[PDB]
Amino acid sequence: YIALITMAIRDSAGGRLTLAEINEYLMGKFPFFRGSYTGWRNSVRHNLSLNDCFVKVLRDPSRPWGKDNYWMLNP
């Protein structure tokens, strides 16, 4: 989950990213994940910030459809 998260966050470049898209492809890539329990987003996101150690935004005014998230990470 760590490595996966690493490559997931890698989507960015130490600037900003959307966990919405990250998780979007996460489940769209990992079948086992989409066939176990779609409730790890809590442990994933948790470790996400508890891993990289960046800053996120509490649902900013920029969510298409109404279910997105923007995170801001940097070195």
What is the domain-level CATH number for residue 74?
A: 1.10.10.10
- Take residue 34 and report the two structure tokens written for it: 């989409």
Number of structural domains in the chain: 1
Q: How far apart are CA 26 and CA 45, in angstroms?
A: 12
Q: Is 7 helix (H, G, I), strand (E, B) or coil?
A: helix
Q: Which residue has the tokens 């470790």?
A: 47
Q: State the Cα angle at 53 between 28 and 42, rounded to 5°.
A: 45
State the amino acid at position 34 in one-letter form.
R
Domain that holds residue 61: 1-75
Q: Residue 53 corresponds to which tokens in the numbers above?
A: 């150690």
